[PDB]
RNA sequence: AUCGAGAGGG
DNA sequence: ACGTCCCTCTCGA
Protein backbone atom coordinates (compact mmCIF):
# COMPACT_ATOMS: atom_id res chain seq x y z
CA UNK A 1 0.00 0.00 0.00
CA UNK A 2 1.07 3.47 -0.26
CA UNK A 3 1.06 5.82 2.61
CA UNK A 4 -1.27 8.10 3.18
CA UNK A 5 1.83 10.65 4.04
CA UNK A 6 4.84 11.52 1.98
CA UNK A 7 8.05 11.61 3.09
CA UNK A 8 10.88 13.74 2.56
CA UNK A 9 14.25 11.78 0.93
CA UNK A 10 17.62 12.70 0.30
CA UNK A 11 21.28 11.86 0.74
CA UNK A 12 22.12 13.55 4.29
CA UNK A 13 25.88 13.27 5.18
CA UNK A 14 26.17 10.83 8.55
CA UNK A 15 28.89 9.76 10.53
CA UNK A 16 29.92 6.74 12.31
CA UNK A 17 31.08 7.67 16.07
CA UNK A 18 33.32 6.12 18.44
CA UNK A 19 30.40 4.43 20.72
CA UNK A 20 29.84 0.74 20.16
CA UNK A 21 27.33 -1.35 22.32
CA UNK A 22 29.22 -4.35 22.36
CA UNK A 23 31.95 -1.84 23.43
CA UNK A 24 30.00 -0.78 26.66
CA UNK A 25 27.91 -3.48 27.65
CA UNK A 26 28.77 -5.44 30.81
CA UNK A 27 27.79 -7.96 33.66
CA UNK A 28 29.16 -8.70 36.84
CA UNK A 29 27.85 -11.26 39.48
CA UNK A 30 30.10 -12.07 42.35
CA UNK A 31 33.51 -11.21 41.13
CA UNK A 32 36.97 -9.60 41.24
CA UNK A 33 37.62 -7.84 45.03
CA UNK A 34 39.60 -5.44 45.95
CA UNK A 35 41.94 -5.81 48.72
CA UNK A 36 41.60 -2.55 52.01
CA UNK A 37 37.91 -2.35 51.30
CA UNK A 38 36.92 -6.02 50.26
CA UNK A 39 34.32 -4.71 47.68
CA UNK A 40 33.48 -5.07 44.32
CA UNK A 41 36.34 -3.24 41.91
CA UNK A 42 36.32 -0.40 38.95
CA UNK A 43 34.91 -1.22 35.51
CA UNK A 44 34.82 -3.23 32.37
CA UNK A 45 38.22 -3.36 32.04
CA UNK A 46 38.98 -5.45 35.87
CA UNK A 47 35.54 -6.37 35.46
CA UNK A 48 33.69 -5.36 38.33
CA UNK A 49 30.59 -4.21 39.58
CA UNK B 1 33.35 11.26 81.18
CA UNK B 2 34.19 9.19 84.27
CA UNK B 3 35.41 5.56 82.20
CA UNK B 4 34.86 6.64 78.49
CA UNK B 5 36.58 9.75 77.83
CA UNK B 6 38.19 10.99 80.43
CA UNK B 7 40.68 14.41 79.30
CA UNK B 8 43.46 13.20 80.85
CA UNK B 9 43.83 10.97 77.58
CA UNK B 10 43.92 13.86 75.52
CA UNK B 11 47.13 13.36 75.80
CA UNK B 12 48.43 10.43 74.33
CA UNK B 13 50.95 7.93 76.19
CA UNK B 14 50.58 4.68 74.71
CA UNK B 15 49.66 4.78 71.09
CA UNK B 16 47.57 2.32 69.13
CA UNK B 17 49.02 0.29 66.07
CA UNK B 18 46.62 -0.75 63.31
CA UNK B 19 47.23 -4.27 61.83
CA UNK B 20 48.07 -5.17 58.45
CA UNK B 21 44.67 -5.10 56.80
CA UNK B 22 44.35 -1.21 57.52
CA UNK B 23 47.73 -0.69 55.86
CA UNK B 24 48.68 -4.02 53.98
CA UNK B 25 51.35 -4.21 50.93
CA UNK B 26 51.23 -5.39 47.78
CA UNK B 27 53.85 -6.87 45.40
CA UNK B 28 55.14 -4.19 43.17
CA UNK B 29 59.12 -8.12 46.32
CA UNK B 30 55.68 -6.24 47.98
CA UNK B 31 55.55 -2.68 49.40
CA UNK B 32 54.15 -1.69 52.89
CA UNK B 33 51.34 1.03 52.85
CA UNK B 34 51.38 4.82 53.49
CA UNK B 35 50.42 4.13 57.35
CA UNK B 36 53.36 1.13 57.60
CA UNK B 37 56.17 3.85 56.30
CA UNK B 38 54.73 6.92 58.37
CA UNK B 39 54.79 4.93 62.13
CA UNK B 40 58.15 3.69 60.62
CA UNK B 41 58.81 7.21 60.77
CA UNK B 42 57.10 7.51 64.23
CA UNK B 43 59.12 4.89 65.79
CA UNK B 44 62.20 6.31 64.28
CA UNK B 45 61.31 9.56 65.91
CA UNK B 46 60.26 7.67 68.67
CA UNK B 47 63.40 6.48 69.66
CA UNK B 48 65.72 9.03 68.77
CA UNK B 49 64.25 10.69 71.56
CA UNK B 50 63.95 7.58 73.96
CA UNK B 51 67.53 7.86 73.90
CA UNK B 52 67.89 11.66 73.60
CA UNK B 53 66.22 11.71 77.28
C1' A C 1 48.17 -3.49 40.92
C1' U C 2 48.32 1.86 44.04
C1' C C 3 48.00 7.13 44.25
C1' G C 4 48.64 11.71 40.73
C1' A C 5 47.39 14.33 36.08
C1' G C 6 44.72 14.29 31.46
C1' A C 7 40.42 13.89 27.12
C1' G C 8 35.35 11.99 26.26
C1' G C 9 30.30 9.58 27.37
C1' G C 10 25.08 10.42 28.93
C1' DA D 1 32.84 25.55 55.03
C1' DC D 2 31.94 22.22 51.32
C1' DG D 3 31.27 22.51 46.74
C1' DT D 4 25.23 17.04 41.35
C1' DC D 5 24.93 11.46 40.37
C1' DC D 6 27.46 7.45 37.22
C1' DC D 7 30.07 5.46 33.26
C1' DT D 8 34.23 4.49 29.13
C1' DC D 9 38.63 5.01 27.75
C1' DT D 10 44.30 6.79 27.94
C1' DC D 11 49.13 7.40 30.71
C1' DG D 12 53.66 8.92 34.20
C1' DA D 13 56.54 7.13 39.36
Not at chain 1, 4 to 25: E, S
Request: net charge positive; glycine share 6%.
Amino acid sequence: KKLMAQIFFGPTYYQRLRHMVDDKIHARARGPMQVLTRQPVEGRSRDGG
Amino acid sequence: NEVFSRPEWMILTCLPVPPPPVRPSISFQRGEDDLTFKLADILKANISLETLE
